Amino acid sequence: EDVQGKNCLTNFHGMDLTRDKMCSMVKKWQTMIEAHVDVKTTDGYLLRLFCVGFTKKRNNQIRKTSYAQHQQVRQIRKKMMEIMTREVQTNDLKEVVNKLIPDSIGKDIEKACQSIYPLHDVFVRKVKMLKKPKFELGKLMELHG
Amino acid sequence: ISIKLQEEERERRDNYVPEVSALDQEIIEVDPDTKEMLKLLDFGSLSNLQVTQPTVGMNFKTPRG
Amino acid sequence: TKKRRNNGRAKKGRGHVQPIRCTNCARCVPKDKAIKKFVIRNIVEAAAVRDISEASVFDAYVLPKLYVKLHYCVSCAIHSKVVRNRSREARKDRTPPPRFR
Amino acid sequence: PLAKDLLHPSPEEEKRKHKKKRLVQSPNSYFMDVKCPGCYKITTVFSHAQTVVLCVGCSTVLCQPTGGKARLTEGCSFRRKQH
Amino acid sequence: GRMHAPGKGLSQSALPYRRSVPTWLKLTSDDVKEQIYKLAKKGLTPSQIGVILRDSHGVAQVRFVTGNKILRILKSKGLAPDLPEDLYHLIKKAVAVRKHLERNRKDKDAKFRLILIESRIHRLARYYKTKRVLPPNWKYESSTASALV
RNA sequence: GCGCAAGACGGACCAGAGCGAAAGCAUUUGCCAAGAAUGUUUUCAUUAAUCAAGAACGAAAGUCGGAGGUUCGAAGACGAUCAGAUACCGUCGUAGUUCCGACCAUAAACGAUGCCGACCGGCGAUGCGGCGGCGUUAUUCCCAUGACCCGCCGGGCAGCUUCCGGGAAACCAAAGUCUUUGGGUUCCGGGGGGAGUAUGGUUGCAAAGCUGAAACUUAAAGGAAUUUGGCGAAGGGCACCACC
RNA sequence: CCCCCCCUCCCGGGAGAGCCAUAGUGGUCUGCGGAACCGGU
RNA sequence: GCAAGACUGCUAGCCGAGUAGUGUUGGGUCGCGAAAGGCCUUGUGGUACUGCCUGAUAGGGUGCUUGCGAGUGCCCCGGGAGGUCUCGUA
Ligand SMILES: [Zn+2]
DSSP, X not given: OEEXXXXXXXXXXXXEOOHHHHHHHOOSXXXXXXXXXXXXXXXXXXXXXXXXXXXXOOTTOXXXXXXXXXXXXXHHHHHHHHHHHHTTTTSOHHHHHHHHTTTHHHHHHHHHTTTTSOEEEEEOOEEEEEEOOSOOSHHHXXXXX | OOOXXXXXXXXXXXXXXXXXXXXXXXXOEEOHHHHHHHHTTSOOOOSSOEEOOOOOOSOSSOOOO | XXXXXXXXXXXXXXXXXXXXXXXXXXXXXXXXXXXXXXXEEESOXXXXXXXXXXXXXXXXXXXXXXXXXXXXXXXXXXXXXXSOOOOTTTXXXXXXXXXXX | OOSOOSSSOOHXXXXXXXXXXXXXXXOSOOXXXXXXXXXXXXXXXXXXXXXXXXXXXXXXXXXXOOSSSXXXXXXXBOOBOOO | OOSSSSOOOOOOOOOOSOOSOOTTOOOOHHHHHHHHHHHHHHTOOHHHHHHHIIIXXXXXXXXXXXXXXXXXXXXXXXXXXXXXXXXXXHHHHXXXXXXXXXXXXTOHHHHHHHHHHHHHHHHHHHHHHHTTSSOTTOOOOSXXXXXXX
């Protein structure tokens, strides 16, 4: 966003996952649940968060498929949408980026979905920055210590 | 080959029997289901038999799919 | 005469399946009839593995794996020696090929 | 198999079969006598009520409509009445 | 199986063998008929009257507490509906389908279902005509929907 | 590498799994209408099965009138392979591929098997609804519910085995209960060409669609399965007249 | 003499929501009987 | 009112105390949890472990050792000694 001299300053712009990890996560005999939410933070940083989830097999399960009902999938997607939209509008980007360093949102979604169908991993596989507010210098120089 | 001597040493081993019965053991491990089955044929309790705890855990038939 | 109990596919109560494209060829074939091959492969096999391993910036690193799925038409699947003809009674065996390597 | 006794089947066999495949058609449903510790008047309900019921005396909702039986409200005692 | 759909099913009632009122039912015939009259005045149909009586009042079915069926009792008192309940339901369903079809002209499946429903209506109306319950000049017409609500 | 615009499209998840009369159907959400199955001690009481006339839907290609034309690509233009290619191949490439209407009503539209109903073996799985029962999990207690497991019931796409039975056989729980031949009802086949041709009718702007012969000609044309025949098919064995 | 280490073996002790016998203890379930019954508030 | 059996949770002094607080999806009489201080008889014995994280020594994740498969071993502090821990091989 700005360079002072012989030293350039940056800002958060997005986050992605390794393509190999995403390829290895999508396997057979499990249902993938997708959800994109267009939710803005306290300031005008609009993000389109995506989500990926899978079902697995219990330790005593014999059924190889382990699928889910369509209504259960819809309920899970609604839960994920609500969880992500709840933890965005209440806080600024500066520390929700820190929140994004661990899978705290993913862990919250995983814990919230134990009642519908037990999912194992919740990942925000992509975050885009759709709109940004008017360029500011004070926030930038506060960001870099 | 149809041998009639049948490996003399192993034939003797076949002839050898132990002094113990190897079956008339003093302790019998049986589930309550077998005890209930026995209780309703002709006889009831025994003095050389005891019920064991129910071995039903989760299930048999390990996951194959 | 009829060769297989099925029609060389898995469509039993549908009547139509999505058409896909072959990988080796460009032929358009039904999904359930087209032989699907899934392969797990690394970036380097046995030659550049050392060169990446000992000559690297970071230590204790696991090499990435390239993931891709293959669709083969019958002619392309046989010409590439993926499947081969079997006996009349040997075609009824649906067990997957043994995998130990 | 070849020599069964279809005239006198065991009760287990008869209860295994469908209600309309038995030797004589007999429903497997029954009536109930539901009551709660709150109110002190007793009503009569059907097992597959399929209709929301209010206790006579406006106490609380008793039964719940489902696919099969009725989800009895928690804290209620019922007995199988028969003749 | 089903008359129109190619599906086969087996799910309906199964009346018990013993044709006698249970002893635990203290309700007489007169009060049951009074409840039937009250429910009819409330604005229900014999389809739900039996349901309400077998759920709340605990009576198995009318045909044992009294001799006449529900529709028979309603005809006897005189407040029975002039049109059969099933024909009314079929006509209402046909009107609903046609109202859905007026705006969306590309829904071919709705057209097929409407054709099937009109066929069912014609087949039931023929039986009503031959069993002497509707006038011989009664005809089901596409536009006549407002009067037959 | 960063942004913009346009069109098509819905990968992996995707299965001998689901729905629909068939053709056919996949990004999230919102609205409208419909349906099979399971549950029922609700309702009417023969309202039932198949169908000449007639009627709706009907893949892509096909035509007419508008809007758009990203990509693929009949016709056409070009270059090499070739003895000869206006074929295989490669680069451009109009009509079409997209949507809104107006038409045709055609397939290997195949399960090459019409529908309804009864009966005659077994064995595990899967999807729906209902029902009974130990035990784990949404952390440790109490209940309802999801998820897991052990069974049962009804309908549905299918799977495995067999001297039920049948067929010429391939094979079939139906392609069975058929000379010991009769459950009900529609369409349709009479050796192979000529020939789905000419003609007459009929529908369509057209392309073409439905009905549809005769004259002449032949003793064969065809269905299933074995041993050698050959493969520009696969997989094995041997040989210093093969190699290292 | 090297190292910093890291690992393994033979002993002592600390922590835990393990199990088993004994105390502080709290509830769930089962057997018998109410001199004999039919209605009205 | 007689009346003995079958089982269960917590404390390993008792009291305050299942008080605050945490807490879960729908609820409930609820899971989780030491005390400040006091009154005193002044606080039961045998028994093995323990890779990292999350939320018990439960449950769910996920490893290290030699390419690979099975072992031994992997909480902390205090003593001693030693230095390629055992069997098979895409
Ligand atoms: Zn190909």
